[model samples]
Target: GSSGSSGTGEKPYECNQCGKAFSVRSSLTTHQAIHTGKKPSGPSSG
Candidate 1:
């Protein structure tokens, strides 16, 4: 059971480019867009 617990004491998702961290994968990817100079790809489509 890798990474089975997220007890609010640690941020499992962290950016390798920067030291930024997020609570969820979506937030991490979206935020990485700004760092990587690309748009945030989401499942929500218009």
Candidate 2:
């Protein structure tokens, strides 16, 4: 019997500043912007 027990750690994100790792790429992308002081802009629906 072959058990599916192959364990592997994978990081999808990496910080541009400190080189820290993250499980999600979105999280790292957002975090990187904080240091750059830049933000995404969109039209406000009001």
Candidate 3:
């Protein structure tokens, strides 16, 4: 019996900031952001 027809080779999500594309949403989210350049949301301690 035939296993069934299947297709591949496609990107599910694309980054708006850049032209980079990813197969999964999680990967795309992480890749689309500059995590190292951002600071935590908290006030300075005196």
Candidate 4:
């Protein structure tokens, strides 16, 4: 059930850039990476 929502009908965190909502703030933060091109400490290219 880690699909961004806790199934509790309480998604408070939202992405202003894309209008996508999340259950947790961290989840929304992680999702924002897609917009900023920031990765989770890994190789940037092959």
Candidate 5:
């Protein structure tokens, strides 16, 4: 029997700084900012 491939069930990206894994690459990228001391600025910021 073939163990058919699935979707959205894996976390391939990992952060070297904190050993955190994320399912999405963008989420990992955003998480990396925390280690770099980069402040996030947007409408949420005043």
Candidate 6:
């Protein structure tokens, strides 16, 4: 289970730090750094 594969083209990007229950890697990313400021690329800077 540790080395298993995820077959989908898109991922279920749930917020591990904030618990948003979302997807697309964009889901958690949108609201992520606001709560933690840890995820590198900020949308304001991008």
Who wins the lDDT comparison? 1
TM-score of 4: 0.46
Q: Report how far off residue 46 is in candidate 2 (Å).
A: 39
Model 6 per-residue lDDT at 6: 59
Which tens-of-lDDT digit does each residue in 1-46 have in candidate 4? 3565546556577877878888878888788878796448666767
Residue 3 displacement (Å), model 1: 12
TM-score of every model versus the real structure: 0.46, 0.41, 0.41, 0.46, 0.48, 0.42
Model 2, range 1-46, lDDT digits (tens) per residue? 6555477535646775767878887888777876686568878855
Would you list the rank order by lDDT, best first? 1, 5, 4, 2, 3, 6
Q: Is candidate 2 or candidate 5 better by lDDT?
A: 5
How many clashes show up per model? Answer: 0, 0, 0, 0, 0, 0
| CA lDDT for candidate 3 | 0.67
Query: Candidate 1: which pairs clash?
Result: none
lDDT at position 16, candidate 4: 75
In model 4, what is the error at residue 30, expressed in angstroms?
Answer: 1.1
Better of 2 and 3 by lDDT: 2
Error of 5 at 3 (Å): 24
Which portions of model 6 show Cα errors greater than 4 Å? Answer: 6-11, 39-46
Of 3 and 5, which scores higher on lDDT? 5
After superposition, the stretches of candidate 5 with alpha carbons farther than 4 Å from their true spots are: 1-10, 37-46
**Pairwise lDDT winner, candidates 2 and 6:** 2
Better of 3 and 6 by TM-score: 6
